Amino acid sequence: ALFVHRDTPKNNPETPFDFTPENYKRIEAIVKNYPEGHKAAAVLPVLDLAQRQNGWLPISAMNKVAEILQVPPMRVYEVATFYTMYNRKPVGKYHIQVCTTTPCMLRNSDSILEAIQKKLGIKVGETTPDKLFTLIEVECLGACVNAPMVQINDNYYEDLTPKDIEEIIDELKAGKIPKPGPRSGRFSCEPAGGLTSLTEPPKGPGFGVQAGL
Amino acid sequence: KTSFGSLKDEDRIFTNLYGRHDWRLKGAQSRGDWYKTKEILLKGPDWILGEVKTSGLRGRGGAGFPTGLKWSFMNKPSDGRPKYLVVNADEGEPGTCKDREIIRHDPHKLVEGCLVGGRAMGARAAYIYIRGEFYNEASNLQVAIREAYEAGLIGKNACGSGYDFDVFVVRGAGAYICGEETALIESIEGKQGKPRLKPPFPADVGVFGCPTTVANVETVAVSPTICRRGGAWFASFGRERNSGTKLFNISGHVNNPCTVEEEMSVPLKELIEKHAGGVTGGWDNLLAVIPGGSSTPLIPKSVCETVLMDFDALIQAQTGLGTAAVIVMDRSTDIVKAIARLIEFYKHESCGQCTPCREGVDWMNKVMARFVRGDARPAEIDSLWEISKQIEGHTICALGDGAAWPVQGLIRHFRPELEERMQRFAQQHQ
Amino acid sequence: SNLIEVFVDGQSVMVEPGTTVLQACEKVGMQIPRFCYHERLSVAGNCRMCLVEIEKAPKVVAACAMPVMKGWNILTNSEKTKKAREGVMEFLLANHPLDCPICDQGGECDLQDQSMMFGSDRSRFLEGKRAVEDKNIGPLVKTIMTRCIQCTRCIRFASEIAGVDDLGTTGRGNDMQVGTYIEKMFMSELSGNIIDICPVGALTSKPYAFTARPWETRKTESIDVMDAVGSNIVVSTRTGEVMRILPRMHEDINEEWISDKTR
Amino acid sequence: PFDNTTYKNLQHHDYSTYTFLDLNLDLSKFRMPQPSSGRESPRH
Ligand SMILES: NC(=O)C1=CN([C@@H]2O[C@H](COP(=O)(O)OP(=O)(O)OC[C@H]3O[C@@H](n4cnc5c(N)ncnc54)[C@H](O)[C@@H]3O)[C@@H](O)[C@H]2O)C=CC1
Ligand SMILES: Cc1cc2nc3c(=O)[nH]c(=O)nc-3n(C[C@H](O)[C@H](O)[C@H](O)COP(=O)(O)O)c2cc1C
Ligand code: SF4
Ligand code: SF4
Numbered sequence: 001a002l003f004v005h006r007d008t009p010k011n012n013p014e015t016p017f018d019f020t021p022e023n024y025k026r027i028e029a030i031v032k033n034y035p036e037g038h039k040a041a042a043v044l045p046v047l048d049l050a051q052r053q054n055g056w057l058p059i060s061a062m063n064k065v066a067e068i069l070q071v072p073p074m075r076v077y078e079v080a081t082f083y084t085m086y087n088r089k090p091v092g093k094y095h096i097q098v099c100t101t102t103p104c105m106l107r108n109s110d111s112i113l114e115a116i117q118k119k120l121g122i123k124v125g126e127t128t129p130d131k132l133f134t135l136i137e138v139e140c141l142g143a144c145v146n147a148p149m150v151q152i153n154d155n156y157y158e159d160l161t162p163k164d165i166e167e168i169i170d171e172l173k174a175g176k177i178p179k180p181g182p183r184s185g186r187f188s189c190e191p192a193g194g195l196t197s198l199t200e201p202p203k204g205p206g207f208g209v210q211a212g213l
Numbered sequence: 214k215t216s217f218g219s220l221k222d223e224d225r226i227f228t229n230l231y232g233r234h235d236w237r238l239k240g241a242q243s244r245g246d247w248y249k250t251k252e253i254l255l256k257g258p259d260w261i262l263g264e265v266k267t268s269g270l271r272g273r274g275g276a277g278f279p280t281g282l283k284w285s286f287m288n289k290p291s292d293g294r295p296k297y298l299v300v301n302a303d304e305g306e307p308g309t310c311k312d313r314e315i316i317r318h319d320p321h322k323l324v325e326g327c328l329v330g331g332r333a334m335g336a337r338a339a340y341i342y343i344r345g346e347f348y349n350e351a352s353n354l355q356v357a358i359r360e361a362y363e364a365g366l367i368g369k370n371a372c373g374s375g376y377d378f379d380v381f382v383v384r385g386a387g388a389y390i391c392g393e394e395t396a397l398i399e400s401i402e403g404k405q406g407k408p409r410l411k412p413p414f415p416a417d418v419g420v421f422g423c424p425t426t427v428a429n430v431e432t433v434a435v436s437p438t439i440c441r442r443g444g445a446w447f448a449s450f451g452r453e454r455n456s457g458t459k460l461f462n463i464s465g466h467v468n469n470p471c472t473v474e475e476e477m478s479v480p481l482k483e484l485i486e487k488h489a490g491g492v493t494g495g496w497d498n499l500l501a502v503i504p505g506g507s508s509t510p511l512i513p514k515s516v517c518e519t520v521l522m523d524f525d526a527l528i529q530a531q532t533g534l535g536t537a538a539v540i541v542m543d544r545s546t547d548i549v550k551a552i553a554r555l556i557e558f559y560k561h562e563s564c565g566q567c568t569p570c571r572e573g574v575d576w577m578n579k580v581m582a583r584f585v586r587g588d589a590r591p592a593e594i595d596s597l598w599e600i601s602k603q604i605e606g607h608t609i610c611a612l613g614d615g616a617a618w619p620v621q622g623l624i625r626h627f628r629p630e631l632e633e634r635m636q637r638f639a640q641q642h643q
Numbered sequence: 644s645n646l647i648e649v650f651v652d653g654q655s656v657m658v659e660p661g662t663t664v665l666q667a668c669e670k671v672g673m674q675i676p677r678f679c680y681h682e683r684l685s686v687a688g689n690c691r692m693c694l695v696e697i698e699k700a701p702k703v704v705a706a707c708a709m710p711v712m713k714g715w716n717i718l719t720n721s722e723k724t725k726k727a728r729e730g731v732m733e734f735l736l737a738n739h740p741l742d743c744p745i746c747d748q749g750g751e752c753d754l755q756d757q758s759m760m761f762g763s764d765r766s767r768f769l770e771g772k773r774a775v776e777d778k779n780i781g782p783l784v785k786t787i788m789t790r791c792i793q794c795t796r797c798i799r800f801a802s803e804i805a806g807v808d809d810l811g812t813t814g815r816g817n818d819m820q821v822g823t824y825i826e827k828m829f830m831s832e833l834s835g836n837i838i839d840i841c842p843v844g845a846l847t848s849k850p851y852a853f854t855a856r857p858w859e860t861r862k863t864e865s866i867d868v869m870d871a872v873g874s875n876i877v878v879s880t881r882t883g884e885v886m887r888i889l890p891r892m893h894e895d896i897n898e899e900w901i902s903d904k905t906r
Numbered sequence: 907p908f909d910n911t912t913y914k915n916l917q918h919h920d921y922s923t924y925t926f927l928d929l930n931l932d933l934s935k936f937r938m939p940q941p942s943s944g945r946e947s948p949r950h
């Protein structure tokens with residue numbers, strides 16, 4: 001929760017970090033998306049790439065991103081502390097993010113936060129001792145009609161009950177991967193008691209196209 | 214036309230909103246996407262801007278600026294710099310989950326919108342700044358962009374029209390402020406997502422210092438349907454200056470929380486009772502509705518009975534249309550706790566750049582955290598009102614406005630509930 | 644000429660295109676209050692102290708950044724300009740520490756002075772304040788970052804004039820902190836001028852610390868001899884003893900800076 | 907046959923941690939040559 005860095009033996013500028021060569025090819029593809037003379041625009045993806053290789057960002061991933069993009073290291077530190085996805089501390093293998101803003105709080109996200117807490121034996125911000133789960137509490141994840149929902153590392157788990165999130169944590173501990181979707185009967189975002197719209201077949205190419213075109 | 218709503222399925226722009234059809238290129242072309250795109254591109258920028266101006270399309274991001282007038286700010290000869298369309302796909306607003314559905318289920322509609330809009334504004338390329346939390350949606354959009362490049366629909370000689378146009382996807386990294394257009398531009402440029410002061414507007418100095426139009430996913434993705442069906446078709450829905458269709462996200466205390474496409478000036482009661490299954494406990498169980506996502510002020514049940522869900526009728530209801538994200542709150546809701554959680558959101562999502570938001574949004578969150586418990590006195594209500602008025606209009610971007618407005622709506626419609634909260638705190642703690 | 648006509652409080656003034664509202668008011672001898680604007684740094688526009696009413700416009704504009712349009716009547720002393728200044732000063736003083744007796748900036752503090760001139764006379768802030776961890780940027784600049792008002796004159800100086808790029812803002816929101824993010828020592832040849840341009844006592848002189856106080860200092864205008872630049876300085880003395888050395892503005896020599904050897 | 911009862915977007919169940927960046931690497935060959943500001947960086 002701090003925004004200064006102190007050198008620890010597991011987080012220092014001599015902590016070993018380097019990209020894999022396939023990650024260097026991915027970095028070249030990232031840098032080619034931006035105009036010549038604006039290589040600094042590749043700070044946010046490549047640093048995120050450094051989080052996808054390592055799981056988190058020690059201050060050698062920040063220094064390596066600053067070195068390969070020829071930007072000052074402070075301008076990478078600003079990005080790494082500004083944005084809430086960059087893990088500047090090592091998180092667990094499954095980073096559970098429970099949304100507790102008002103559309104999820106109205107549909108009882110506190111019960112699911114408590115269910116994760118009493119299932120994993122930890123609280124908000126802590127990590128399980130086997131380094132598998134980090135539970136934090138995030139803002140609106142943009143799945144508001146699928147409230148209450150969580151995010152696990154890339155995946156949204158939606159329309160949750162305490163039983164559903166206990167089942168998801170059970171099959172995360174069992175090595176399997178759960179299905180990223182609503183755990184209720186519906187599929188993505190439709191009304192749960194049947195389609196109130198888009199029941200007709202779509203019309204296809206050419207329908208309603210005006211004259212002179 | 215006087216009554217609005219009951220939109221037919223043949224008039225839906227966002228068919229395959231629900232993922233029930235193939236989102237890929239065969240399914241998109243079988244639903245009407247990428248049809249006669251070359252004939253749209255060869256009619257020039259002025260024809261496309263005329264169709265968007267005739268359609269009455271306003272900014273679906275939430276402010277409702279006229280889209281054709283906005284996009285015509287780029288209709289000017291080049292000065293050596295390239296021009297850029299930038300598609301705002303951040304969608305950080307609580308309540309709002311519609312652009313996720315457009316990216317996830319109609320991605321080629323967004324890509325064709327990028328092509329048509331960038332042809333209208335003379336843009337070289339499109340940068341779709343997608344939210345970093347929408348990882349599966351971003352990879353979904355990248356598969357559709359690969360299908361559009363491999364079909365020759367974008368890239369070198371896009372749709373066989375002789376117009377070169379790239380479509381890039383930049384992922385965010387977890388900042389709600391990076392959906393504000395200049396903060397989004399700063400986030401694309403590899404910096405902290407801090408908003409720029411306006412002027413310069415992005416059509417003068419935007420991304421990389423180039424001419425730039427930042428436009429929402431929804432106002433971009435409806436533009437090929439506007440160019441095909443006609444602007445007079447799109448202006449036939451909703452009231453005047455309130456034209457078209459709109460995606461609505463009814464969440465909170467309804468029976469069936471859902472995203473649905475609906476005609477523009479639909480009643481809020483008709484929308485909730487028709488597509489969302491009504492309020493939990495009936496319509497008489499309704500306490501309040503945040504009409505357009507978290508930045509719009511709440512309206513109580515007496516306003517929600519007759520109000521129309523477009524821009525002008527919600528401005529007359531002293532709230533905003535916003536992102537058209539209907540957050541429904543029933544009688545069992547601690548409404549001070551919900552608005553204070555919303556102000557807690559706005560202090561966790563505040564980039565810290567200018568003084569009134571950086572200091573006053575945290576100070577409003579502290580006052581609201583005391584108002585939940587009642588640990589306050591009634592003279593601090595009007596004080597808080599003035600604090601909101603010292604943030605509104607005094608900041609760099611409208612996140613300060615969007616944090617002051619829920620406080621103002623809560624005070625304006627629920628001052629007696631705040632007062633009875635504080636006096637019961639005072640009588641059971643003194 | 645291509646001068647446009649603008650108005651400051653009804654008074655006409657002819658300005659070059661691209662003149663800001665603040666500079667147009669400066670041409671009639673009115674100094675708009677500011678904290679983040681500095682005429683030798685790039686425009687930031689984030690302290691919001693320079694907010695001023697343009698008439699027939701229902702929104703105050705940031706005068707340091709906003710270019711004037713032809714025919715604007717800038718209302719520097721109107722009611723909503725003064726309310727904007729009082730509100731912004733209230734937010735600046737909400738979390739600011741009660742350190743004026745122990746702070747070296749007292750008496751020569753921009754925050755004190757234009758709190759007296761443009762802010763209210765009392766507080767409505769009934770909460771606890773933030774407290775910021777102090778940084779260590781070297782033996783010259785004492786750092787007390789609770790006093791920081793986040794005007795980013797630090798960062799713009801170190802980036803643009805000193806050419807260093809080691810200062811920045813980490814974090815977000817009210818927890819946004821100006822610093823280096825690491826234990827890093829800001830030792831330029833020009834590193835002492837961030838003591839000058841810090842409007843508050845967040846960056847002070849560590850050798851000058853606690854010794855004197857600006858009202859009792861006699862100001863002797865003199866010349867640097869530490870090099871052949873001839874930087875114009877103020878030697879501030881007190882009771883026959885040299886207390887410190889500040890720059891003088893000479894536009895053709897040292898514009899308003901001095902080297903750390905000089906300082 | 908017209909189907910409106912199944913969810914056709916089942917591809918993102920199989921996306922890994924490098925799916926977006928491998929798609930960007932695949933798309934790198936389809937793109938136009940970038941414009942240049944004429945200098946290597948604004949600090950050049
Ligand atoms: N969609 C979402 O996820 C969210 C949407 N919002 C909405 O954002 C809105 C505020 O957004 P802003 O862009 O900050 O405010 P808005 O006043 O400025 O501007 C909207 C658009 O119009 C353009 N524009 C406005 N006046 C102009 C002028 N004179 N010249 C040229 N261009 C001009 C701006 O460049 C911008 O692209 C609110 O209404 C809120 O509901 C807020 C938060 C989240
Ligand atoms: C704090 C803040 C966050 C915003 N977030 C978004 C967003 O996530 N998506 C979006 O489309 N617009 C967002 N906006 C509105 C944009 O600034 C801008 O008006 C819009 O993205 C593009 O204009 P348009 O509505 O014509 O498409 C936000 C505005 C503010 C002040
Ligand atoms: S009002 Fe808040 S969100 Fe906007 S520039 Fe200022 S600190 Fe940032
Ligand atoms: S910086 Fe100024 S206002 Fe703050 S404690 Fe020092 S003298 Fe007082």
Ligand code: SF4
Nearest residue numbers: 791792794795797841
């Ligand atoms: S330390 Fe001083 S100069 Fe630096 S940002 Fe803070 S108030 Fe401004």
Ligand code: FES
Nearest residue numbers: 099104140141143
């Ligand atoms: S409120 Fe939880 S996802 Fe939007």
Ligand code: FES
Nearest residue numbers: 679690691693707
């Ligand atoms: S002086 Fe213009 S905002 Fe700081």
Ligand SMILES: [K+]
Nearest residue numbers: 838841843846
């Ligand atoms: K100082």
